[PDB]
Amino acid sequence: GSRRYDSRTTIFSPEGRLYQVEYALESISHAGTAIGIMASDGIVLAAERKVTSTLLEQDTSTEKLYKLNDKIAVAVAGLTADAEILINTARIHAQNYLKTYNEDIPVEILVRRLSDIKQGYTQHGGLRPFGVSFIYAGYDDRYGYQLYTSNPSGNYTGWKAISVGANTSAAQTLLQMDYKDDMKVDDAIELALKTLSKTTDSSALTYDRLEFATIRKGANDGEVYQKIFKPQEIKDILVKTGIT
Amino acid sequence: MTDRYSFSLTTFSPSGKLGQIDYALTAVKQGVTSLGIKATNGVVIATEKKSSSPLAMSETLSKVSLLTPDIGAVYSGMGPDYRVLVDKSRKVAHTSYKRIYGEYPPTKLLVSEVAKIMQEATQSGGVRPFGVSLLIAGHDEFNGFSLYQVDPSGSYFPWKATAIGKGSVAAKTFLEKRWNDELELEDAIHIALLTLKESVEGEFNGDTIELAIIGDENPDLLGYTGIPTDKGPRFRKLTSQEINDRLEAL
Amino acid sequence: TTTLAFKFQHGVIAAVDSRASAGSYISALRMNKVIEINPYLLGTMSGCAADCQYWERLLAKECRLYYLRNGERISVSAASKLLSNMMCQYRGMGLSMGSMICGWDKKGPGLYYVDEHGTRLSGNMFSTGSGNTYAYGVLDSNYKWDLSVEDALYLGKRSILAAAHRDAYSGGSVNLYHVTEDGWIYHGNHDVGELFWKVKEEEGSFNNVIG
Amino acid sequence: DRGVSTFSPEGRLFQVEYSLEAIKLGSTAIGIATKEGVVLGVEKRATSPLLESDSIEKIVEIDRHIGCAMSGLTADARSMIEHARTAAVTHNLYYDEDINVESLTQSVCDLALRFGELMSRPFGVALLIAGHDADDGYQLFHAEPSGTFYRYNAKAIGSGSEGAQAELLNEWHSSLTLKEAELLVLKILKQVMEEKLDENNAQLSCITKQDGFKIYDNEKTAELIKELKEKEAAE
Amino acid sequence: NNYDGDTVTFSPTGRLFQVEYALEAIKQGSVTVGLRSNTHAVLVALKRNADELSSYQKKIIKCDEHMGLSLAGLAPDARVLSNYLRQQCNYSSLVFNRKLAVERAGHLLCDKAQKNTQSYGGRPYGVGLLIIGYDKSGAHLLEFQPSGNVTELYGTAIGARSQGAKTYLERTLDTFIKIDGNPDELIKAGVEAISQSLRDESLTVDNLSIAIVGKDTPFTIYDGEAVAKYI
Amino acid sequence: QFNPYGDNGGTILGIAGEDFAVLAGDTRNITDYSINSRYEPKVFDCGDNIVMSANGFAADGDALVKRFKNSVKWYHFDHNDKKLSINSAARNIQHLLYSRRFFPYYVYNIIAGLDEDGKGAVYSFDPVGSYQREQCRAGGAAASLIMPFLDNQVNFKNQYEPGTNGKVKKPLKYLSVEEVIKLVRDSFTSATERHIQVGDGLEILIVTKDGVRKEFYELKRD
Amino acid sequence: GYDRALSIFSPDGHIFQVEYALEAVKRGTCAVGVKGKNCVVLGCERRSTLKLQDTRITPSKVSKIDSHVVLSFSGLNADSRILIEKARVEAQSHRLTLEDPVTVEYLTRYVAGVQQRYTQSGGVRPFGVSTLIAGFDPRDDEPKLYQTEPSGIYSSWSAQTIGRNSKTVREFLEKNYDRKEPPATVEECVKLTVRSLLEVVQTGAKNIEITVVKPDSDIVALSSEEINQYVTQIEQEKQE
Amino acid sequence: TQQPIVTGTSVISMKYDNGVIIAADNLGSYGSLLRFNGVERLIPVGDNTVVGISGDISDMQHIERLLKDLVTENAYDNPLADAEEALEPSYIFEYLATVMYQRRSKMNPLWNAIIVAGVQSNGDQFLRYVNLLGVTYSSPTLATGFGAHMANPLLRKVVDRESDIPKTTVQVAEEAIVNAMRVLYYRDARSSRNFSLAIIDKNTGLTFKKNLQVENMKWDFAKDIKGYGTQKI
Ligand SMILES: [Mg+2]
């Protein structure tokens, strides 16, 4: 019958690894690098679009940075289509929480929920896992500014600074070298772009090959603002930091 | 009976490749060339009507399809997969949008819905991916004119101009040289016809070429008068005669 | 019907009448209105005898399965709850049940009132049935915690008699039970007809009745 | 791969035959039936000295008149015990009486072959079900994952089973006392066990008509072990 | 070989190996004999023990007052099939106030077994059954194979070494069919038949199992000292 | 509107002796003011030395009896032909009845037999499952006419010993099967006179250690 | 639905999927449990391959199931969340239906049952997780420590360790832990738990987590500095 | 739950020494309207059973089809379908009785009163009643509806108890049945003159008589009846 053709996506290897999760991670390692850096007065999200074209409509394009709600955003590394399925689910979860408790969803609770969905695909159902790694950048009144990452295994962890996608080994070393705890957003912006500029597989880092975002309390008084950078604004910050 | 294939047929290989998606993209590569060019006041989509037999009436086979009054689609790859996607795309535009908001969806969101369907065929149990790449051109009030490509993976990208299928690599290079941000719709149609001639071997005329535009509202194609706000569809399929007229000024 | 139960120094007393009626016709002179769930648990009966018997025997199943799994006797609090939770499933469907769950556990003697409503109340004294008002009067005026087992047994016995006399739908006989930490002890079936005359003489009560 | 409910060319179910191999790796459990009661004894086999051995529960009460010992993948036994306890109590609810030991055993064995593509595989544990009823007296059954159950006068299951069964072949007779059976289980357990038998790494139990099913205290078993040592040194 | 992985697969010569392997389980099973006259039908079964401490596995199951069977192969499968027969016999009585014809009982068993041979996931039954019964058309004996094949016979045997008993019945055909109104002589012929399948072991008191049904005889099983008469 | 229930009349009576038991009931079946049958048996031998009668709505009574007889059959299959004790049968019937708590068998049921000590036993049920063991119980149409009589002549209620003037009760001496049958016949003869649904015939089943025996007696046909 | 039997017996009588789940536990960070006379301590390894971590928000290794019971683990992190959630739901379900909080043994039995169920249900794989469940029963001052594993077996331990290099720390505990006289105080119990992890951990900095659970719902997690003082005192005695 | 629309009145029957007789008129009433005059309400099943049905006709036609299907189904894989394993009256009745009680237990009855009359394999007479409630009973005489009130009294004068059955001949039984049908025609407002009668004898088998009429009626005395009390003319 059908058994013959079953790849069995949810099984352990003899070494105790999940084949499909490991191969999904291999897929993600070829995706454009995404970086998150948490500062005392905000969070930075920086990501590299993959080998683009001159005819690509960049200002209406979105492949890396997505808004989950007004307080929480994600950077994507892997299959974009897979990511959008999960993103829409996360958006709904945030609204369910807001409807139920009349308060914005705490960042971790949203992260845990999505990470649990990923986990389920590795344990039951016989389907392939989502080939996606997320960097979550968010704010709530309990823990303030937070960075998380999740991968196809459904495991998530918190970070001060982190990278996903290609060249994470090189990227993480560079971040670990120059990161400090008393760092500010404007400094973090510079670190993120410098790290991408050194780890990129492209010849040079330009505005058309980047997506950029910040989450700041640089919103008028006690509140938080999300800023998805426009192509011209990415071009300006590249000049400001002295990369182009 | 029962569909006992409740497991994924697309899976990650050791190298991180999703084989069935790659192979679907290979099927798209073998497909006949189709293209799309965005102008300042319109969008054009075009393809070759590769007739399987001269006894076949190629007018009855529509490669360029209306999805909504302001959105049109064309493809490269497997025709039957495209046909059913058009049926689903037309319906989802109503069920998940028009019946809720009382208006047709914007291009990007209809594309998103089509993309979702294609993504699900890449992960759901007991199905292969769709063997097509779609080029969807459209217009809506707040986003203006737009052109999107949708691949078998479900990934979609907005383009100023692009080509897919047989001679896409050569066609995209041709479009890069000719495209600018000041093109009028007639200029885009002219460039479309030029680009498309390179990939066509045999007859090149209005009967062997299928071409449509997203442009100005067509009140003559609305079918009724009396409501000022209803001004007619922006999608229009060019006739065999209309194509031949522009082939003399080629 | 008349049932009561109360907690005191040396455990809990449980007393009930024995009558059953079909309108004015007395269908049963001797009906057991106490359920021997297990050697340490008792259940009274009020309303549909079918529903009382069925669900309390089903409770016994659950209490026994509890002991087998946990290797420890179930508490009166837990037992009473299991029962109330069964009622809450058929909430609105038309069950009729009013039972006191009597027992002795770690926290000492225990008494819980449970009804078809799902309600579950803890307390030192309860009485249910068409004749509960008569029983409460005798209880309230004579109840102490400092009661001896002998006096307590008589009190519950006398309180049923009070109801049996006045209430038309209560009578027949009195069944007594005493619950200790070593289990429950049955203190017999007492014909009301014989008990009435006996009490009237010894106690001097019921002067208005000619004997 | 291949079906879970597949027959071999010899006419045996592969999965059932393989589960029997898992039971061979389990710790030894021995049962001896007498006219004064049935004795159940097990090897605890703690994997480390820090493991509190009294938490090893390989002998279990099903009802007051039925006990049970296990060998193999002991985690699989929990749902079987739960079903057995439910069946025993449910029958008491429906019929106001104790359930027959055979009927209880048959109810457990009905679960066995409910596997396929129901549970995904057979149970990897064998059970020695011992009990007493008024109709057939003291009984000992061996419940397998095949769905088959044999009644036994004495039976050993687990890693030292064939050696123990040969020993039970010689030692059992129809006039054994309860005390004789107790010492006999201890003797054969001590023989097949890797580590030296004591009250902490071995457990005894019995079922009698009067007192029902009882697991023995470590103090009670320790005395029976000391009684065993002296009687073996007596000749 | 490559076609025995499941029941849903024909071999190149048109064989169903999983069914054939299920048939093999019957051959491993202990011998049982069936035979009938015009007034009675008899089952005789050689029970098998695990060892000397163990009991002898029961082989005969009662289905109704007028019907029952003996098994050879997987005992749990016999319990499933016999339970189904019990229900069907019972459905006929409760709904139609009618005792279930033995021939119809055979048709029902055939169809139940057949479904397990044509579908994926399941397995064939690993047991053979000899059904005896007395209905409105007299005494009957059926042989059930888990392939689905059910056959009405005067006599037969299934299990290990069953060929010896089957040859004996084939010789004795003209004699035992005429044993009318004599239950003891019909059982004797069955005990003599099953004796042709014995090697090394002989028929003891807790080894032998006998059942009988007839004109004025409900289906009754004889075990223990009740069969010492026939040893 | 469809009324799924009906009343087929009839009256039944069970008495427990010291080493025997009787279950009697009239053989008349009726609807409203019409007679359906003058002889339609209502008390049955269910096997295992148990007799049963489901009085009230005949269709539900026939269904319950049919089910119980089936429960006996399967008890034998499942538990190695073990005999079903009267107390076990009683508890089983409770569960048969309560399975329709929300669409009951409109019948008042009685069973009779011997307990496991050989003594006489009678169990009485209500439509929804509650049950209890008794010495004497009349059920059905003329139950209210018969039960007071039995309280008086079987349990000697309100009867005292001459000379004492209410100080000493009449001692509860056991009754013989012949004595019981007289009380049964006189019960039904009296009921037949004053109850229109009672008449035609009386069938009694007597249960002893030797087995089940039947006795039939004519009743007035008006 | 997907019904495929993933956990099945092999010719030698092994369920490889269950055994491969144990290999996932072997890969997981080391967890240790030590019960004193009036407390239980749960120690957990944190691999220092991950720095730049935000320790405020990163899922802690020890999780409260109820106010009086905790659960630590070794193996797949994502898998452990499912067991923890189920355990927490069951804990509230028990309080709601029985009016007593769960015993530590009951909670262990439930979690172990869930793990077992996933070894013979169709379409699912076993949990790649072993757990240490510790606490005190309601109105009881006797310490409780249990261990579960993917197969679904569970048992009580005076002291136990699971995860990578657990063989080494178990070796240490077996020679250092005396049953006749367990760590009489909180100090001694924590000291022995830290000492045991120092056999395996590497640096005694942020790699060691300690959580002390005392009777009557008294649960606290030690900070870096508090643990660092134990690390300091241990090695200064060792220099001799 | 429904209400009957097109209805059939009384069905009457009785046992005699060698068999049973059953009869029923050929009318299908629509309330007070005598709508259909050619309705057969006696339905033979084989050569040993006749099922007489009163009540809702649409439900009768449904039952008629169940019986026809029952005969077909019994013949399946049955070499003795026309012999030892042929349908008996008791089988047919119990089947119907099962259906009727099940339908009432779903609160969707077959609005009928049925009498199954026939002769068993051993020659015994079979006569039993069943209705929409699933109620069953047997008696030497059986009748439905009005027949229960008017026919039974007359038929019971012939066979008052079981011992009268052997004393009753087919000629006497048929005569009593035919008289009863006349009485019902006089007194039942929902009856017709035309009827069918069936005899199932253990020797002569099934005799089915159609197109019978009520005859020998008394009406002449009506001419003398004038007014409602005091009128003379
Ligand atoms: Mg009368």
mmCIF file with all atom_site columns, N, CA and C in Angstrom, chain G residues 133-147:
data_model
loop_
_atom_site.group_PDB
_atom_site.id
_atom_site.type_symbol
_atom_site.label_atom_id
_atom_site.label_alt_id
_atom_site.label_comp_id
_atom_site.label_asym_id
_atom_site.label_entity_id
_atom_site.label_seq_id
_atom_site.pdbx_PDB_ins_code
_atom_site.Cartn_x
_atom_site.Cartn_y
_atom_site.Cartn_z
_atom_site.occupancy
_atom_site.B_iso_or_equiv
_atom_site.pdbx_formal_charge
_atom_site.auth_seq_id
_atom_site.auth_comp_id
_atom_site.auth_asym_id
_atom_site.auth_atom_id
_atom_site.pdbx_PDB_model_num
ATOM 1  N N  . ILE G 1 133 ? 11.808 14.552 38.593 1.00 0.00 ? 133 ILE G N  1
ATOM 2  C CA . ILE G 1 133 ? 10.667 15.198 39.229 1.00 0.00 ? 133 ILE G CA 1
ATOM 3  C C  . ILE G 1 133 ? 10.852 15.167 40.745 1.00 0.00 ? 133 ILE G C  1
ATOM 4  N N  . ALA G 1 134 ? 10.860 16.351 41.357 1.00 0.00 ? 134 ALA G N  1
ATOM 5  C CA . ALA G 1 134 ? 11.140 16.488 42.784 1.00 0.00 ? 134 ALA G CA 1
ATOM 6  C C  . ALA G 1 134 ? 10.134 17.400 43.472 1.00 0.00 ? 134 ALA G C  1
ATOM 7  N N  . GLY G 1 135 ? 9.972  17.196 44.777 1.00 0.00 ? 135 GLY G N  1
ATOM 8  C CA . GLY G 1 135 ? 9.080  18.020 45.588 1.00 0.00 ? 135 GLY G CA 1
ATOM 9  C C  . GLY G 1 135 ? 8.722  17.376 46.916 1.00 0.00 ? 135 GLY G C  1
ATOM 10 N N  . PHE G 1 136 ? 7.693  17.919 47.561 1.00 0.00 ? 136 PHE G N  1
ATOM 11 C CA . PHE G 1 136 ? 7.170  17.383 48.812 1.00 0.00 ? 136 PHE G CA 1
ATOM 12 C C  . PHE G 1 136 ? 5.661  17.224 48.707 1.00 0.00 ? 136 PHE G C  1
ATOM 13 N N  . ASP G 1 137 ? 5.149  16.070 49.128 1.00 0.00 ? 137 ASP G N  1
ATOM 14 C CA . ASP G 1 137 ? 3.704  15.842 49.159 1.00 0.00 ? 137 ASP G CA 1
ATOM 15 C C  . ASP G 1 137 ? 3.036  16.843 50.106 1.00 0.00 ? 137 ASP G C  1
ATOM 16 N N  . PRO G 1 138 ? 1.759  17.185 49.849 1.00 0.00 ? 138 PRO G N  1
ATOM 17 C CA . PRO G 1 138 ? 1.037  18.112 50.728 1.00 0.00 ? 138 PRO G CA 1
ATOM 18 C C  . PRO G 1 138 ? 1.014  17.652 52.185 1.00 0.00 ? 138 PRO G C  1
ATOM 19 N N  . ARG G 1 139 ? 1.400  18.544 53.098 1.00 0.00 ? 139 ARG G N  1
ATOM 20 C CA . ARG G 1 139 ? 1.449  18.250 54.537 1.00 0.00 ? 139 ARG G CA 1
ATOM 21 C C  . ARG G 1 139 ? 2.388  17.080 54.861 1.00 0.00 ? 139 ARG G C  1
ATOM 22 N N  . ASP G 1 140 ? 3.513  17.021 54.153 1.00 0.00 ? 140 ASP G N  1
ATOM 23 C CA . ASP G 1 140 ? 4.522  15.986 54.367 1.00 0.00 ? 140 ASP G CA 1
ATOM 24 C C  . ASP G 1 140 ? 5.910  16.609 54.273 1.00 0.00 ? 140 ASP G C  1
ATOM 25 N N  . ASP G 1 141 ? 6.806  16.189 55.163 1.00 0.00 ? 141 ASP G N  1
ATOM 26 C CA . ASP G 1 141 ? 8.162  16.748 55.233 1.00 0.00 ? 141 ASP G CA 1
ATOM 27 C C  . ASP G 1 141 ? 9.232  15.768 54.731 1.00 0.00 ? 141 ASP G C  1
ATOM 28 N N  . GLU G 1 142 ? 8.799  14.681 54.092 1.00 0.00 ? 142 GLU G N  1
ATOM 29 C CA . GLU G 1 142 ? 9.718  13.708 53.505 1.00 0.00 ? 142 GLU G CA 1
ATOM 30 C C  . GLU G 1 142 ? 10.049 14.111 52.067 1.00 0.00 ? 142 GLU G C  1
ATOM 31 N N  . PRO G 1 143 ? 11.350 14.253 51.742 1.00 0.00 ? 143 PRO G N  1
ATOM 32 C CA . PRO G 1 143 ? 11.729 14.628 50.376 1.00 0.00 ? 143 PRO G CA 1
ATOM 33 C C  . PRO G 1 143 ? 11.393 13.551 49.345 1.00 0.00 ? 143 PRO G C  1
ATOM 34 N N  . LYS G 1 144 ? 11.054 13.985 48.133 1.00 0.00 ? 144 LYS G N  1
ATOM 35 C CA . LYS G 1 144 ? 10.712 13.083 47.034 1.00 0.00 ? 144 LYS G CA 1
ATOM 36 C C  . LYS G 1 144 ? 11.540 13.423 45.805 1.00 0.00 ? 144 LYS G C  1
ATOM 37 N N  . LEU G 1 145 ? 12.107 12.398 45.175 1.00 0.00 ? 145 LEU G N  1
ATOM 38 C CA . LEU G 1 145 ? 12.846 12.564 43.927 1.00 0.00 ? 145 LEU G CA 1
ATOM 39 C C  . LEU G 1 145 ? 12.598 11.356 43.032 1.00 0.00 ? 145 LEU G C  1
ATOM 40 N N  . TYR G 1 146 ? 12.086 11.609 41.829 1.00 0.00 ? 146 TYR G N  1
ATOM 41 C CA . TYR G 1 146 ? 11.790 10.555 40.859 1.00 0.00 ? 146 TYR G CA 1
ATOM 42 C C  . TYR G 1 146 ? 12.477 10.816 39.526 1.00 0.00 ? 146 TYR G C  1
ATOM 43 N N  . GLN G 1 147 ? 12.643 9.756  38.738 1.00 0.00 ? 147 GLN G N  1
ATOM 44 C CA . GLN G 1 147 ? 13.197 9.859  37.392 1.00 0.00 ? 147 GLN G CA 1
ATOM 45 C C  . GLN G 1 147 ? 12.292 9.145  36.405 1.00 0.00 ? 147 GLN G C  1
#
